[PDB]
Amino acid sequence: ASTKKLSESLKRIGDELDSNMELQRMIAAVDTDSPREVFFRVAADMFSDGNFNWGRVVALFYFASKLVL
Amino acid sequence: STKKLSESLKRIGDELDSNMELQRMIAAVDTDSPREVFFRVAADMFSDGNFNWGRVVALFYFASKLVLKA
């Protein structure tokens, strides 16, 4: 427990997002014609179990960022 | 197709929320000044020089839990 430990945990997590080549490839393999359709399709499957927890929403926000930027 | 990605993202989000160590350290921020905590953690996260989007999203995950507790 400390501010150092928290920063390293977040640093580790963020670095896991960007360096996960499998995720990056799946994200690139989706589409680039019409992001709106891709977003709602991915969102529907992510939440088909009904669980709308904050971690998943942030994952979806990361995905949308890569789609529009 | 879209399924493997959605499953991948769902797993990442559930892992964030089940990171008990992470949830526990974040819950310990009973500070008079959230701003200082925010800048302190953000400074350590970027002390190398790499301002990559993944770290920013994790900082955004942290900041949301930090600020939306009041």
Curated annotation (Swiss-Prot), chain A:
Expressed in a wide variety of tissues. Isoform Psi is found in glial tumors. Isoform Alpha is expressed in spleen, breast, ovary, testis, colon and brain, and at low levels in skin and lung. Isoform Sigma is expressed in spleen, breast, ovary, testis, lung, colon, brain and at low levels in skin. The keyword Disulfide bond does not apply. GO terms for biological process: apoptotic mitochondrial changes; apoptotic process; apoptotic process involved in blood vessel morphogenesis; apoptotic process involved in embryonic digit morphogenesis; apoptotic process involved in mammary gland involution; apoptotic signaling pathway; B cell apoptotic process; B cell homeostasis. A motif (BH3) lies at residues 6-20. Keywords: Acetylation, Apoptosis, Cytoplasm, Host-virus interaction, Isopeptide bond, Membrane, Mitochondrion, Mitochondrion outer membrane, Nucleus, Transmembrane, Transmembrane helix, Tumor suppressor, Ubl conjugation. GO terms for molecular function: BH3 domain binding; channel activity; Hsp70 protein binding; identical protein binding; lipid binding; protein heterodimerization activity; protein homodimerization activity. The keyword GTP-binding does not apply. Ubiquitinated in the absence of XRCC6/Ku70. Ubiquitination promotes protein degradation. One of its GO terms (cellular component) is cytoplasm. A motif (BH1) lies at residues 45-65. It comes from the Eukaryota. Plays a role in the mitochondrial apoptotic process. Under normal conditions, BAX is largely cytosolic via constant retrotranslocation from mitochondria to the cytosol mediated by BCL2L1/Bcl-xL, which avoids accumulation of toxic BAX levels at the mitochondrial outer membrane (MOM). Under stress conditions, undergoes a conformation change that causes translocation to the mitochondrion membrane, leading to the release of cytochrome c that then triggers apoptosis. Promotes activation of CASP3, and thereby apoptosis. Intact BH3 motif is required by BIK, BID, BAK, BAD and BAX for their pro-apoptotic activity and for their interaction with anti-apoptotic members of the Bcl-2 family. Homodimer. Forms higher oligomers under stress conditions. Forms heterooligomers with BAK. Interacts with BCL2L11. Interaction with BCL2L11 promotes BAX oligomerization and association with mitochondrial membranes, with subsequent release of cytochrome c. Forms heterodimers with BCL2, BCL2L1 isoform Bcl-X(L), BCL2L2, MCL1 and A1. Interacts with SH3GLB1. Interacts with humanin; forms fibers with humanin which results in BAX conformational changes and sequestering of BAX into the fibers, preventing BAX activation. Interacts with SFN and YWHAZ; the interaction occurs in the cytoplasm. (Microbial infection) Interacts with adenovirus E1B 19K protein; this interaction blocks BAX oligomerization. Belongs to the Bcl-2 family. This is Apoptosis regulator BAX. It comes from Homo sapiens. The chain holds residues 54 to 122 of 192 of the full protein.
